[PDB]
Amino acid sequence: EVKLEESGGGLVQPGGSMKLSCAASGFTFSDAWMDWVRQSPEKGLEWVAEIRSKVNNHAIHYAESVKGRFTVSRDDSKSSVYLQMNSLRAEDTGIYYCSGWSFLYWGQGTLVTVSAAKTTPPSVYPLAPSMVTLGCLVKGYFPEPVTVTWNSGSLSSGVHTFPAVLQSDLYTLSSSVTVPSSTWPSETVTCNVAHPASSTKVDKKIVPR
Amino acid sequence: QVVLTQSPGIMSASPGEKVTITCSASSSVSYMYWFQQKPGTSPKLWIYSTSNLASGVPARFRGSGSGTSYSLTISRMEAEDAATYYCQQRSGYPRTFGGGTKLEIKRADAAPTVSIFPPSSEQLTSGGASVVCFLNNFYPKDINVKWKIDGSERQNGVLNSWTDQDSKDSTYSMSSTLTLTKDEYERHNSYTCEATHKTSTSPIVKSFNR
């Protein structure tokens, strides 16, 4: 099988630099043209850069939006492709995919956030009132992402986790869960919130008022 | 740069229905390529060189077209086909993608389940008061939420968020958060969210008193 293992993503302030790496395996890397593609809500899928194979002279093309700021390169002996990103702007924010063999293979993507806003852990607040709906409010964090589970994932149905919304340079997200009302508060309901960027891992029990 | 315009931007279908989505290029291209994406995962090559199915793509799918006009056809749709499909051209540089066609699942209408939540004691201690309204599991996706404080409509300070179609029951959900300071929140008694949805002529109203 093919693996495209990206790394080097994260949060950087505007004017800063990041270097993305993609380690490829499961295909003959020396024959492959490789591409970087990024994704954002506002601009959708955008081709960033192409680098051809050795026989095609490792020829390189860039999207005009990144010309002069981004550099693609490859190391065939390490089966790896790279994207050096300089002079980063807010609009360079998005998921960056390593793509192999002219868009046949895609990596899982790495999130690149370009903002002046600093890393901030969420405040996690319980939302308590035949079925009962409960929730947790995951407020004031940066950057994305956060994950939310209920009862360590064992409460898998009944759950809606809402896309986070950026206001005041901070994200806010909510999640709901529905359980039989006979089971609450007698049985404990816990929302588990992880924010890797701030190494935050918290469990918030939903207690009655 | 070739501009790819996909039609429709969004549509719903029932399993068994024929689905045709189109890509129009600003200038002619030799071939169109198509990609499938589902939320939370990477795009997958779906069709290459206009009409070739990628490995694993079922025979229901057919790519066609020429010049500036290309299509992706599903002969008989399956629920698993609900996704966003992007066209892409590689006839020069830059490579470009269309804006996507989102194919959703058609289902029966469903009224929102509405739940209002007071600020938590712990948030109040911080000087904050977020009131949260969930509008859960409704169909179709269009809905309006109204906030009222002591019976008077409140606009400003409202954070709204909408889910994608639920992969289980094919419904939509919405969350609405009214954030106040603790001081303003304690200045008032009653807090109300009202959901307007095509399933009822009258709004669904949930409220709490401090």
Side-chain angles (χ1 to χ4, degrees), chain A residues 49-72:
Chain A
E50 172 190 88
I51 189 167
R52 301 181 185 188
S53 53
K54 320 245 228 330
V55 71
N56 291 316
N57 299 133
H58 289 142
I60 288 165
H61 299 260
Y62 296 102
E64 287 295 325
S65 55
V66 309
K67 278 241 89 166
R69 299 182 307 116
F70 286 19
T71 303
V72 59

Short mmCIF file of all heavy atoms in Angstrom, two decimals, chain A residues 49-72:
data_model
loop_
_atom_site.label_atom_id
_atom_site.label_comp_id
_atom_site.label_asym_id
_atom_site.label_seq_id
_atom_site.Cartn_x
_atom_site.Cartn_y
_atom_site.Cartn_z
N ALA A 49 2.03 23.49 -5.74
CA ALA A 49 3.33 23.29 -6.38
C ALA A 49 3.42 21.88 -6.93
O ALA A 49 2.84 20.96 -6.36
CB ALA A 49 4.46 23.53 -5.38
N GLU A 50 4.15 21.75 -8.03
CA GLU A 50 4.46 20.47 -8.65
C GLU A 50 5.97 20.34 -8.72
O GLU A 50 6.67 21.33 -8.98
CB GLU A 50 3.91 20.43 -10.08
CG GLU A 50 4.34 19.20 -10.89
CD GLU A 50 3.97 19.33 -12.36
OE1 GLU A 50 4.76 19.89 -13.15
OE2 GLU A 50 2.87 18.86 -12.72
N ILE A 51 6.45 19.14 -8.48
CA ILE A 51 7.84 18.80 -8.81
C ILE A 51 7.86 17.45 -9.54
O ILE A 51 7.36 16.43 -9.04
CB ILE A 51 8.81 18.87 -7.58
CG1 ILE A 51 10.27 18.72 -8.05
CG2 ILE A 51 8.41 17.89 -6.48
CD1 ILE A 51 11.31 19.08 -7.00
N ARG A 52 8.39 17.48 -10.75
CA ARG A 52 8.49 16.31 -11.62
C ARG A 52 9.62 15.38 -11.20
O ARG A 52 10.41 15.69 -10.31
CB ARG A 52 8.69 16.76 -13.07
CG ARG A 52 7.55 17.65 -13.56
CD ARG A 52 7.75 18.07 -14.98
NE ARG A 52 6.70 19.01 -15.38
CZ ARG A 52 6.50 19.45 -16.62
NH1 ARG A 52 7.27 19.03 -17.62
NH2 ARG A 52 5.50 20.29 -16.85
N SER A 53 9.68 14.23 -11.86
CA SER A 53 10.70 13.21 -11.65
C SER A 53 12.05 13.59 -12.28
O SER A 53 12.12 14.56 -13.04
CB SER A 53 10.21 11.91 -12.29
OG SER A 53 9.86 12.16 -13.64
N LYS A 54 13.09 12.81 -11.97
CA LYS A 54 14.47 13.06 -12.44
C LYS A 54 14.53 13.07 -13.95
O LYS A 54 15.22 13.92 -14.53
CB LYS A 54 15.47 11.97 -12.00
CG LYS A 54 15.36 11.41 -10.60
CD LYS A 54 16.58 11.74 -9.72
CE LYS A 54 17.13 10.50 -8.97
NZ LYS A 54 16.12 9.44 -8.61
N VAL A 55 13.84 12.13 -14.58
CA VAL A 55 13.86 12.02 -16.03
C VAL A 55 13.21 13.26 -16.65
O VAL A 55 13.52 13.65 -17.78
CB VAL A 55 13.20 10.68 -16.53
CG1 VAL A 55 11.70 10.69 -16.33
CG2 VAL A 55 13.55 10.41 -18.00
N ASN A 56 12.31 13.89 -15.90
CA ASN A 56 11.68 15.13 -16.33
C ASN A 56 12.35 16.34 -15.69
O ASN A 56 11.73 17.40 -15.54
CB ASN A 56 10.17 15.08 -16.05
CG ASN A 56 9.45 14.08 -16.94
OD1 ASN A 56 9.71 14.01 -18.15
ND2 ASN A 56 8.57 13.30 -16.36
N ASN A 57 13.61 16.15 -15.32
CA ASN A 57 14.52 17.22 -14.91
C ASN A 57 14.15 17.90 -13.59
O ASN A 57 14.61 19.01 -13.31
CB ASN A 57 14.66 18.26 -16.03
CG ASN A 57 15.24 17.67 -17.30
OD1 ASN A 57 14.72 17.90 -18.39
ND2 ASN A 57 16.32 16.89 -17.17
N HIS A 58 13.32 17.22 -12.79
CA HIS A 58 12.80 17.77 -11.53
C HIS A 58 12.20 19.15 -11.73
O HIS A 58 12.34 20.01 -10.86
CB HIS A 58 13.90 17.84 -10.46
CG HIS A 58 14.31 16.51 -9.92
ND1 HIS A 58 15.62 16.20 -9.61
CD2 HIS A 58 13.59 15.40 -9.65
CE1 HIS A 58 15.68 14.96 -9.16
NE2 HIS A 58 14.46 14.45 -9.17
N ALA A 59 11.53 19.35 -12.86
CA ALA A 59 10.99 20.66 -13.20
C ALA A 59 9.89 21.05 -12.21
O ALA A 59 9.17 20.20 -11.70
CB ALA A 59 10.46 20.70 -14.63
N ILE A 60 9.80 22.35 -11.94
CA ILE A 60 8.97 22.84 -10.84
C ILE A 60 8.04 23.92 -11.34
O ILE A 60 8.45 24.77 -12.12
CB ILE A 60 9.83 23.43 -9.71
CG1 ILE A 60 10.57 22.31 -8.95
CG2 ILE A 60 8.97 24.23 -8.73
CD1 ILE A 60 11.69 22.83 -8.09
N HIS A 61 6.78 23.85 -10.92
CA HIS A 61 5.83 24.93 -11.14
C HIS A 61 5.10 25.27 -9.84
O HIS A 61 4.87 24.38 -9.02
CB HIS A 61 4.80 24.55 -12.21
CG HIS A 61 5.40 24.25 -13.54
ND1 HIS A 61 5.41 25.16 -14.58
CD2 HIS A 61 6.02 23.14 -14.01
CE1 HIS A 61 6.00 24.63 -15.63
NE2 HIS A 61 6.38 23.40 -15.32
N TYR A 62 4.76 26.55 -9.69
CA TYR A 62 4.08 27.09 -8.52
C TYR A 62 2.81 27.81 -8.94
O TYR A 62 2.74 28.38 -10.03
CB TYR A 62 4.97 28.10 -7.80
CG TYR A 62 6.23 27.52 -7.23
CD1 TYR A 62 7.45 27.70 -7.87
CD2 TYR A 62 6.20 26.79 -6.04
CE1 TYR A 62 8.62 27.17 -7.35
CE2 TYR A 62 7.36 26.22 -5.52
CZ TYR A 62 8.57 26.42 -6.18
OH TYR A 62 9.73 25.87 -5.67
N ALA A 63 1.82 27.79 -8.05
CA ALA A 63 0.69 28.69 -8.12
C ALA A 63 1.22 30.11 -7.97
O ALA A 63 2.13 30.36 -7.18
CB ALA A 63 -0.28 28.37 -7.01
N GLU A 64 0.64 31.05 -8.72
CA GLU A 64 1.07 32.43 -8.66
C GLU A 64 0.99 33.02 -7.25
O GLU A 64 1.86 33.79 -6.86
CB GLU A 64 0.29 33.31 -9.66
CG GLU A 64 0.70 33.08 -11.13
CD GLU A 64 2.15 33.49 -11.45
OE1 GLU A 64 2.66 34.48 -10.88
OE2 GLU A 64 2.78 32.80 -12.30
N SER A 65 -0.01 32.61 -6.47
CA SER A 65 -0.18 33.07 -5.08
C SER A 65 1.01 32.76 -4.15
O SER A 65 1.14 33.38 -3.09
CB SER A 65 -1.48 32.54 -4.46
OG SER A 65 -1.56 31.12 -4.55
N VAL A 66 1.86 31.82 -4.55
CA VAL A 66 2.99 31.40 -3.69
C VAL A 66 4.37 31.60 -4.32
O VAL A 66 5.38 31.42 -3.65
CB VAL A 66 2.82 29.95 -3.17
CG1 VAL A 66 1.42 29.73 -2.54
CG2 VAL A 66 3.09 28.94 -4.27
N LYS A 67 4.41 31.96 -5.60
CA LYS A 67 5.66 32.20 -6.32
C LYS A 67 6.52 33.19 -5.55
O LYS A 67 6.04 34.25 -5.13
CB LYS A 67 5.40 32.76 -7.71
CG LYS A 67 5.07 31.72 -8.76
CD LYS A 67 6.09 31.69 -9.91
CE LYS A 67 7.25 30.75 -9.62
NZ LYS A 67 8.06 30.45 -10.84
N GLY A 68 7.78 32.83 -5.34
CA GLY A 68 8.73 33.67 -4.61
C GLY A 68 8.70 33.44 -3.11
O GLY A 68 9.62 33.87 -2.41
N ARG A 69 7.65 32.81 -2.60
CA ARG A 69 7.55 32.56 -1.16
C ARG A 69 7.73 31.08 -0.78
O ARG A 69 8.28 30.77 0.27
CB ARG A 69 6.23 33.12 -0.59
CG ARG A 69 6.07 34.64 -0.75
CD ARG A 69 4.77 35.17 -0.15
NE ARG A 69 3.58 34.45 -0.64
CZ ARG A 69 2.78 33.71 0.13
NH1 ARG A 69 3.01 33.59 1.44
NH2 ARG A 69 1.74 33.11 -0.40
N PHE A 70 7.27 30.17 -1.64
CA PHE A 70 7.29 28.73 -1.35
C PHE A 70 8.33 28.06 -2.24
O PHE A 70 8.49 28.44 -3.40
CB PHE A 70 5.93 28.08 -1.64
CG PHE A 70 4.85 28.39 -0.63
CD1 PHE A 70 4.95 29.48 0.24
CD2 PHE A 70 3.72 27.59 -0.57
CE1 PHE A 70 3.94 29.76 1.15
CE2 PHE A 70 2.69 27.87 0.33
CZ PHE A 70 2.80 28.95 1.20
N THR A 71 9.01 27.06 -1.71
CA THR A 71 9.95 26.27 -2.50
C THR A 71 9.66 24.79 -2.33
O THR A 71 9.69 24.27 -1.22
CB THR A 71 11.41 26.53 -2.11
OG1 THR A 71 11.71 27.93 -2.24
CG2 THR A 71 12.35 25.71 -3.03
N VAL A 72 9.40 24.12 -3.44
CA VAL A 72 9.22 22.68 -3.40
C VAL A 72 10.54 22.04 -3.79
O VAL A 72 11.29 22.57 -4.61
CB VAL A 72 8.05 22.20 -4.31
CG1 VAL A 72 8.27 22.60 -5.78
CG2 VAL A 72 7.82 20.69 -4.19
#
